[PDB]
């Protein structure tokens, strides 16, 4: 069961609101493993508060380092589980166009496109 599956919409709307009261600048990002992934390590945490000046490239490096991937290992971060957005895009721009109706930004990571 994913975060969307185990937390009601109404509760998630409230979560976003609680987060923004404490962190008016940060982008709330849900980062989950693709359900068919068997190769990448499992990230220990799923909920990330990301400064609004970070770009996708920087976020990708941050997650790869947290997974302690070697430079040779493959890693993709799919926004909304499908959209491949340019790695140069600032996260605030990703948030503005790809955020969910509940106000969270959803990503899935895997070894494939």
């Amino acid at each position: 069961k994913t975060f969307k599956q185990r937390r009601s919409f109404e509760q998630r709307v409230e979560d976003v609101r609680l987060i923004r009261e404490q962190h008016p600048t940060k982008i709330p990002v849900i980062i989950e493993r693709y359900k068919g992934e068997k190769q990448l390590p499992v990230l220990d945490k799923t909920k990330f508060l990301v400064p609004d000046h970070v770009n996708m490239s920087e976020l990708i490096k941050i997650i790869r380092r947290r997974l302690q991937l070697n430079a040779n290992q493959a890693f993709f971060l799919l926004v909304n589980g499908h959209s491949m957005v340019s790695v140069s895009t600032p996260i605030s721009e990703v948030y503005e166009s790809e955020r969910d109706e509940d106000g969270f930004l959803y990503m899935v990571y895997a070894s494939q496109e």
Binding site: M56, I62, R66
Partner: peptide, 26 residues
């Protein structure tokens, strides 16, 4: 009560900004 939310730190952002490959917007 335990923290739910990882605050991505300035240290890890700066480590990622100091690694190639560097992406340039505009």
């Amino acid at each position: 009560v335990e923290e739910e939310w990882v605050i991505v730190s300035d240290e890890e952002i700066e480590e990622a900004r100091q690694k190639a490959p560097l992406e340039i917007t505009e």
